[PDB]
């Protein structure tokens, strides 16, 4: 039991690493995982960054467990010192807040590699700054509710959660693996947040498949679906097209295939597609990675297409 340990900014339980420190994959392993932590965590932390600005950018040798064993204890020592500090007059740093998107993007990398250890069984990355982008796009209040659909080991429902007000965020996930998955990153993102001392919205993972019974109701009184349906077959595109159409006004739906055409041009031959409840506008992909679609149900287009005619 050779460890390196790095203490919590809020003291949370320390997070405890055995050496030699575990490769995740081949960009990635638990020494650069220490390392970025304490980064942001100086980043949290201005008094930290200066208590060790003389050792936060030093590119130490993640090979020499001493070099190691000397970067956390420099890092345990300041927060030592800066618990010490907030004892006496200086206020502490809020508790309350969500994680910066840098910190969140860290975070969830560490709380995957902790979660997933065999990417193998995943068989049968960059979608954070997917996401990211259309957490900028698409504004949500406390008033919203969010799911995704087909919700994986979790990740992008942790992002929103972390990153928005909605009243509640829903994942939703029928096979097994994934969804047993998603219970271990549910509690590694608890256990972590806390650790960082940070804020997220309320968030459920649930088994079960959103073309169910069950799910059509709630579909109806979801106001952001988002759902990478790029592979969905015809089948499952109508299966939906049928949910969404009981949705309520300013709903939003953000999906890779659209739903309806961004053409759609109401007449007396289609008056009962999908296209007459709502409006579709492609969103602009990011630079470095490709269509994704905004669907906004406004049932006023059907509203003005009966006042035409009653003219
Ligand atoms: C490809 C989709 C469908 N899904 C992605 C898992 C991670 N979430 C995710 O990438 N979300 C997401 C990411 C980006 C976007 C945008 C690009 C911004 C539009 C939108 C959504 C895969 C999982 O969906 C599950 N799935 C498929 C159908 C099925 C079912 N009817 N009920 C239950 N879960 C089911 C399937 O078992 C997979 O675990």
Known sequence: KLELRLKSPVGAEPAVYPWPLPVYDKHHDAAHEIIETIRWVCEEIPDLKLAMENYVLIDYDTKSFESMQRLCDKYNRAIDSIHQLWKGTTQPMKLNTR??????????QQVYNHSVTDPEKLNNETSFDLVAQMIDEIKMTDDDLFVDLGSGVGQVVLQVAAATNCKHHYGVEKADIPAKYAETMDREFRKWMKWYGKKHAEYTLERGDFLSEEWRERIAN????????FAFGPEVDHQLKER???MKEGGRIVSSKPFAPLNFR????????????????????????????????DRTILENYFSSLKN
């Open 244 to 246: 969404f159409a009981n």
């Open 222 to 229: 979801t106001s952001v679906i988002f759902v990478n349906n």
């Open 99 to 108: 994680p910066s998107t840098g910190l969140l993007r860290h975070i969830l």
């Open 266 to 297: 109401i007449n007396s031959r289609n008056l009962s597609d999908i296209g007459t409840i709502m409006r579709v506008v492609e969103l602009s992909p990011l630079k470095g990675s490709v269509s994704y679609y905004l669907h906004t149900i």
